[PDB]
Design a protein around this ligand. Structure first.
Ligand SMILES: NC(=O)C1=CN([C@@H]2O[C@H](COP(=O)(O)OP(=O)(O)OC[C@H]3O[C@@H](n4cnc5c(N)ncnc54)[C@H](OP(=O)(O)O)[C@@H]3O)[C@@H](O)[C@H]2O)C=CC1
Ligand SMILES: COc1cc(Cc2cnc(N)nc2N)c2c(c1OC)O[C@@H](C1CC1)C=C2
Length: 158
């Protein structure tokens, strides 16, 4: 199973200066629940943003750099390697990966951040005429999660 996993704001911002624009623990907890025990596929810049492989799952980085060899990371070098990997693979970012994979994945786990952030990287446009809402669940606000957000699970129609 091939999934996108992504947080994006009302204008589909995903990124600013190689970090997330928002502070939102609940969504990182969401990511953790989903991807633990499974595989993340991520491009190099995104990996460099996370810095270390995420515990307790397979971390796969897509890069052209054949020097690349990082303890705890699998390297692949073309998009097409993605479809080898076994099990539930989450496409994990960034803009270039989402743009490359969005027409190819079975389904997407999106967190809509109900906010307008300044960004420099974006999730590509998509339509609900294409994507059916398997679930929509409001995140809870609290001291430490103070931006409204909705967990969507969307499945390619038809
Ligand atoms: N909100 C969210 O859910 C998430 C947001 N982000 C954000 O996304 C942004 C990063 O996106 P972006 O800047 O596009 O970078 P990416 O993380 O998508 O990585 C870009 C790099 O990935 C590698 N790559 C991509 N496609 C290929 C390919 N087909 N073959 C070989 N290598 C490939 C290249 O690495 P190289 O040049 O080394 O060869 C390329 O430079 C950041 O701002 C980050 O904060 C990231 C993940 C999640
Ligand atoms: C671009 O930066 C990040 C992207 C991401 C990617 C990411 C974040 N949020 C969502 N919903 N999907 C994603 N694909 C993460 C992330 C990032 O910064 C550390 O942090 C980690 C937390 C510490 C364990 C997890 C994810």
């Amino acid at each position: 199973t091939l999934s996108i996993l992504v947080a994006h704001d009302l204008q589909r911002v995903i990124g600013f200066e190689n970090q997330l624009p928002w502070h939102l623990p609940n969504d990182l907890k969401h990511v953790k629940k989903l991807s633990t025990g499974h595989t993340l596929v991520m491009g190099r810049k995104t990996f460099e943003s996370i810095g270390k492989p995420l515990p307790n799952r397979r971390n796969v980085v897509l890069t052209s750099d054949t020097s690349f060899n990082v303890e705890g990371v699998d390297v692949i070098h073309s998009i097409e390697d993605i479809y080898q990997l076994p099990g539930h693979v989450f496409i994990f970012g960034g803009q270039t990966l989402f743009e490359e994979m969005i027409d190819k994945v079975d389904d997407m786990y999106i967190t809509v951040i109900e906010g307008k952030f300044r960004g420099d990287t974006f999730f590509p446009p998509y339509t609900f005429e294409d994507w059916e809402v398997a679930s929509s669940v409001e995140g809870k606000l609290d001291e430490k999660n103070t931006i409204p957000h909705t967990f969507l699970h969307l499945i390619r129609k038809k």
